RNA sequence: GAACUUGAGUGCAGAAGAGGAGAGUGGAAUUCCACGUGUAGCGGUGAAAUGCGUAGAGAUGUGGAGGAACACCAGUGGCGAA
């Protein structure tokens, strides 16, 4: 039973995962578009991000959270939907923080697609 | 052969620079390894599948290993014969 937590939203182009943890990063609960039965294109859509956030939130509310800090990673379109969905579940969102990993010129990226 | 100082160079006084070689050091990120929390998918596509995952993955926290490259600055900006 913990109150304050961080909501890690990993929004990629293919899927949106939402893990909810305590302030010390111990996992309370998590949800992802795939876990909710979305497949392929559907998982990417922002609608699925909403549903993923709601499902993750309702799992956490059992443990008794009230305030969430939000961290967003990846280039997906889910972050806004997932954040608004967390607010709609009742948990107040203190601050959103983009923590997408930025290399300072490190590893060579994979070759560009010729689509 | 003898003069001259503009070319060329030297002296003296300043200026900028990713110019080069050598030796160190630093932060981000990817991967891997160990551990805590935690559960059913993760990944990928135009759509899928191969692949990875209940032998506990992906997500998340701490620490560690190693290799390569140096975000912002950064600019028809600088330096170099290329």
From Swiss-Prot:
Similarity comment text for this entry: Belongs to the universal ribosomal protein uS11 family.
SUPFAM superfamilies: Translational machinery components
Single GO MF annotation: rRNA binding
Role noted for this protein: Located on the platform of the 30S subunit, it bridges several disparate RNA helices of the 16S rRNA. Forms part of the Shine-Dalgarno cleft in the 70S ribosome.
Name of the protein described by the UniProt record: Small ribosomal subunit protein uS11
Species, as recorded: Bacillus subtilis (strain 168)
GO-annotated cellular components: cytosolic small ribosomal subunit
Gene3D superfamilies hit by this protein: Ribosomal protein S11
GO biological process, one term: translation
Quaternary context: Part of the 30S ribosomal subunit. Interacts with proteins S7 and S18. Binds to IF-3. Interacts with VmlR. Interacts with BrxC.
UniProt cross-references to PANTHER family, sorted A to Z: 40S RIBOSOMAL PROTEIN S14/30S RIBOSOMAL PROTEIN S11
InterPro entries: Ribosomal_uS11 (IPR001971), Ribosomal_uS11_bac-type (IPR019981), Ribosomal_uS11_CS (IPR018102), Ribosomal_uS11_sf (IPR036967)
């Amino acid at each position: 039973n913990i109150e304050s937590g961080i909501a890690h939203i990993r929004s990629t182009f293919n899927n949106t995962i939402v893990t909810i943890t305590d302030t010390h990063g111990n996992a309370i609960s998590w949800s992802s578009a795939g876990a909710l039965g979305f497949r392929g294109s559907r998982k990417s859509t922002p609608f699925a991000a909403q549903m993923a956030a709601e499902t993750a939130a309702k799992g956490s509310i059992e443990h008794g959270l009230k305030t969430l800090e939000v961290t967003v990673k990846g280039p997906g379109s889910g972050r806004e939907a997932a954040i608004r969905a967390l607010q709609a579940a009742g948990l107040e969102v203190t601050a959103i923080r983009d923590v997408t990993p930025v290399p300072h010129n490190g590893c060579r990226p994979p070759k560009r697609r010729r689509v």
